[PDB]
Each structure stands twice: as structure tokens, then as C-alpha cells.
Design an enzyme around this catalytic site. Sequence first.
Site, mmCIF file in Angstrom:
data_model
loop_
_atom_site.group_PDB
_atom_site.id
_atom_site.type_symbol
_atom_site.label_atom_id
_atom_site.label_comp_id
_atom_site.label_asym_id
_atom_site.label_seq_id
_atom_site.Cartn_x
_atom_site.Cartn_y
_atom_site.Cartn_z
ATOM 1 N N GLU A 35 0.793 -1.221 0.000
ATOM 2 C CA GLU A 35 0.000 0.000 0.000
ATOM 3 C C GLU A 35 0.832 1.280 0.000
ATOM 4 O O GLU A 35 0.520 2.216 -0.726
ATOM 5 C CB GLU A 35 -0.968 0.047 1.195
ATOM 6 C CG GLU A 35 -2.100 -0.987 1.188
ATOM 7 C CD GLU A 35 -3.144 -0.784 0.085
ATOM 8 O OE1 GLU A 35 -3.211 0.312 -0.504
ATOM 9 O OE2 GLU A 35 -3.911 -1.733 -0.176
ATOM 10 N N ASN A 46 -7.845 9.761 -5.843
ATOM 11 C CA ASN A 46 -8.560 8.950 -6.840
ATOM 12 C C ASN A 46 -9.470 9.909 -7.610
ATOM 13 O O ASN A 46 -10.589 10.207 -7.171
ATOM 14 C CB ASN A 46 -9.411 7.873 -6.150
ATOM 15 C CG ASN A 46 -8.579 6.923 -5.288
ATOM 16 O OD1 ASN A 46 -7.706 6.200 -5.787
ATOM 17 N ND2 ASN A 46 -8.847 6.924 -3.984
ATOM 18 N N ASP A 49 -13.399 9.070 -8.252
ATOM 19 C CA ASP A 49 -14.474 9.248 -7.284
ATOM 20 C C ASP A 49 -14.241 10.368 -6.274
ATOM 21 O O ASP A 49 -15.001 10.514 -5.322
ATOM 22 C CB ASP A 49 -14.815 7.926 -6.591
ATOM 23 C CG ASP A 49 -13.927 7.638 -5.410
ATOM 24 O OD1 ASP A 49 -12.732 7.969 -5.462
ATOM 25 O OD2 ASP A 49 -14.443 7.103 -4.409
ATOM 26 N N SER A 51 -11.993 10.773 -3.899
ATOM 27 C CA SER A 51 -11.615 10.397 -2.541
ATOM 28 C C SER A 51 -10.098 10.298 -2.500
ATOM 29 O O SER A 51 -9.466 10.215 -3.553
ATOM 30 C CB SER A 51 -12.239 9.042 -2.167
ATOM 31 O OG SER A 51 -11.617 7.956 -2.846
ATOM 32 N N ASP A 53 -6.650 8.314 -0.421
ATOM 33 C CA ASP A 53 -6.120 7.250 0.455
ATOM 34 C C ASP A 53 -4.973 7.883 1.265
ATOM 35 O O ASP A 53 -4.055 8.489 0.698
ATOM 36 C CB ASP A 53 -5.568 6.094 -0.375
ATOM 37 C CG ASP A 53 -6.592 5.517 -1.317
ATOM 38 O OD1 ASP A 53 -7.747 5.333 -0.900
ATOM 39 O OD2 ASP A 53 -6.241 5.257 -2.478
ATOM 40 N N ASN A 60 -8.999 5.071 2.965
ATOM 41 C CA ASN A 60 -9.843 5.958 2.152
ATOM 42 C C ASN A 60 -10.778 6.961 2.882
ATOM 43 O O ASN A 60 -11.522 6.610 3.821
ATOM 44 C CB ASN A 60 -10.639 5.075 1.182
ATOM 45 C CG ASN A 60 -11.339 5.866 0.099
ATOM 46 O OD1 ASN A 60 -12.484 6.275 0.272
ATOM 47 N ND2 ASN A 60 -10.673 6.048 -1.033
#
Length: 130
Positions: A35, A46, A49, A51, A53, A60
Site C-alpha cells: 500500500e 482517486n 471518485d 476520494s 487514500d 480511504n
Amino acid sequence: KAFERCELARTLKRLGMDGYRGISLANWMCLAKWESGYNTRATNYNAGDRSTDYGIFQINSRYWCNDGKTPGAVNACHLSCSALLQDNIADAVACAKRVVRDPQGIRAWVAWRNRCQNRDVRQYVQGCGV
């Protein structure tokens, strides 16, 4: 902060991650590796959408933490996403524990399924004294 492999392994162990909800320490290690590369300030927006991380576990902003600019977002961990960017990973670990309390468990992170599931994850904790 960029954690060294074994340094992180011992830290997660001390924070009670080994076997949490049936998830072995080596699995959590495999997750952090893929990750963020064990880096606490890692962020990934992202565009699709809207959002983001955050942190070592790449949590998220749509469901777990509040960053104020994510549409229809919930804050299940009741934390500002800023908390997931600290050198001290205590908040990040508390939130990751929250994530796996949902039915999917560790499967919530697609990276886990791609690179950790059904694989030899011992390598992530070998020689760390955990």
C-alpha cells in the site's frame, strides 16, 4: 516517516495487531508494504471518485476519515485524515482495526487480494524477532 521492515513489525506487534480479528502480523506487513512501502505520509488521490487514500495503510476518505472535500463521506474512525499522516502510527492502527471489523476483513484492500492472499507472507516478518 519511512519505516524499516523489522522496526515496523515490532511496532505493530506492540500495538496488538498480531492475530487481530484472525489476521496474522505478516499479513498486516504485506498490506503496508504494497500500500505505501511502509511510508506514513503516502497519499493517493482517486480522480474517478474524488476520494483520497491516506497513510501507511492507505485508508480511504469516503468511509474512514474526514478530509472535508470527499462527497458523501462518512468518518467511521472518527478521525481527521490528517491523523493518518503522523509519524506515530497509533491512530492509523486504531482505524485499520476498525476497517477489518466489517465482514470483508482484510479483503477490504484490493492490494491485499492481489499480492498477499494465498501467498507466502512469512518473508515480511522473518528475522524481526516477532
